[PDB]
């Protein structure tokens, strides 16, 4: 629906032929996810801003909810110069997602038009909710990592151990290390910092990883990062054949105040696609949909049936959506149900192809006992993780589906969790747990859904 980009046609579309490196899909939306495991004040946001430019966000709410939990995404197109005269990594260039598939060279590289290679999405969180977001479910949250260490400090900083513990627990095999803020660092200082870094990562998953030094503010050696994304990062395997599923992360009401009747639109639901391809005009079911209570106070759920009016990927308009980024499905649902992120925590998929709606879970949890990679300074009990107690509110994080939960009973290691709102899942899924230590939610263990109380979705 937008010019200067590869045409998308539903008729000339086959799910089996679709691959993560397909030019048609990459031309409009990102296909792979590379979470940046860094830290604020160290260039965590600056690196992503330099790589992917500056975004504008098509739809934004007046009030931001769960800003410390939201899994932010940032799309970046990486291109390669076809002229062999231009030396690497200058042939590799990063830019925004709105650029055309080919643009003429802006450098004196003796001609040669740049061609789109890949489209990446940076899974960045203001905290560490990434850990229990992706630590046992797996799904397709990401397949790479960007461990960031600044240069002014000396490795290992007290904020580094948690990052390495996160890299280990995520079971990520593809990690790239970016030494930021090394511009104001002497050569000997940089060398000794690199030596400390390799000593710290000795015997860990970050053994065979690049230690690329970059300067985010001045945009130095970003092309090296793009090159290692091209080469070091392998193509993840994705399943485009199954019925599509999307975990709803955002939700907007796009109708401006004082708009005409003919200009009314449905509810736009942003989210992440796990497995399948969404098509415009496809009948979709959102579960648990409308959750209400009886006169006596009994939970009941009515799944919301609708049709995909349109699909958006950042500023681009799509005809079919594939996993590998934040896709916003504009639908026919009433804006009342999708205003101010009121549909977050729901699963949107093909009709009759959604998991069961649970209100309570019976999980087999393995409780952690010290916070991962934390320095216990003074207070030895601060890093200790207490045992689960009755009437304690945890944070169950099934993949990207966040939900609260009150522990009702623990026998030996089988804990019953009463969710605040019913969620769609299946028996045997890997879930994680979090606890409010102070000012934050911190991972304290994981488990499996042995059993659970389900609720029958009433349909009229």
């Amino acid at each position: 629906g937008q010019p200067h980009l590869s045409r998308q046609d539903l008729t000339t579309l086959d799910v089996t032929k679709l691959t993560p490196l397909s030019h048609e899909v990459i031309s409009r939306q990102a296909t792979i996810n590379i979470g940046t495991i860094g830290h604020v004040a160290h260039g965590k946001s600056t690196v992503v801003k330099a790589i992917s430019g500056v975004h504008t966000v098509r739809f934004k709410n007046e009030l931001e909810r769960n800003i410390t939990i939201k899994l932010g995404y940032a799309n970046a197109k990486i291109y390669k110069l076809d002229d062999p005269s231009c030396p690497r990594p200058e042939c590799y260039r990063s830019c925004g997602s709105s650029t055309p598939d080919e643009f003429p060279t802006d450098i004196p590289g003796t001609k040669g038009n740049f061609k789109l290679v890949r489209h990446v999405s940076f899974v960045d969180c203001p905290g560490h909710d990434i850990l229990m977001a992706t630590m046992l479910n797996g799904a397709a949250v990401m397949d790479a990592a960007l461990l960031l260490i600044a240069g002014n400090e000396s490795c290992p900083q007290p904020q580094t151990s948690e990052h390495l513990a996160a890299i280990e627990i995520m079971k990520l095999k593809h990690i790239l290390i970016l030494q930021n803020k090394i511009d104001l660092v002497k050569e000997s200082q940089a060398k000794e910092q690199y030596e400390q870094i390799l000593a710290f990562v000795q015997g860990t998953v970050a053994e065979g990883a690049p230690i690329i030094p970059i300067s985010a503010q001045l945009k130095y050696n970003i092309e090296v990062v793009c090159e290692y994304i091209v080469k070091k990062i392998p193509v993840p395997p994705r399943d485009f054949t199954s019925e599509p599923r999307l975990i709803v992360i955002r939700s907007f009401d796009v109708n401006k105040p004082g708009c005409e009747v003919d200009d009314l639109k449905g509810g736009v639901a942003g989210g992440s696609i796990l497995k399948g391809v969404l098509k415009v005009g496809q009948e979709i079911e959102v579960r648990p949909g409308i959750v209400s209570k009886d006169s006596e106070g009994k939970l009941m759920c009515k799944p919301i049936f609708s049709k995909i009016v349109s699909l958006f990927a950042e500023h681009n308009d799509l005809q079919y959506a594939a996993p590998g980024g934040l896709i916003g499905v504009g639908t026919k649902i009433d804006p009342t149900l999708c205003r101010a992120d009121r549909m977050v925590g729901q699963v949107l998929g093909a009709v009759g192809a959604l998991p069961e709606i649970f209100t309570e879970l019976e999980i087999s949890y393995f409780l952690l006992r010290r916070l991962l990679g934390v320095r216990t300074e003074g207070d030895k009990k601060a890093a200790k993780v207490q045992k689960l107690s009755k009437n304690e509110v945890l944070m169950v994080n099934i993949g990207s589906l966040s939900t609260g939960g009150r522990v009702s009973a623990v026998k030996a290691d089988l804990g019953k969790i009463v969710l605040t709102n019913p969620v769609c899942t299946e028996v045997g899924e890997k879930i994680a747990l979090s606890r409010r230590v102070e000012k934050h939610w911190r991972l304290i263990g994981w488990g499996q859904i042995r059993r659970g109380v389900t609720i029958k979705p009433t349909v009229d």
Binding site: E187, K191, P213, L218, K232
Partner: peptide
């Protein structure tokens, strides 16, 4: 400067960056 189809080392990137701020 060379046919580095293989992965580099930290030294070459570091001296590249250092050349960058020393020349400008």
């Amino acid at each position: 400067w060379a046919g580095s189809e293989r992965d580099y080392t930290y030294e070459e990137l570091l001296n590249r960056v250092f050349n960058i701020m020393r020349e400008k």
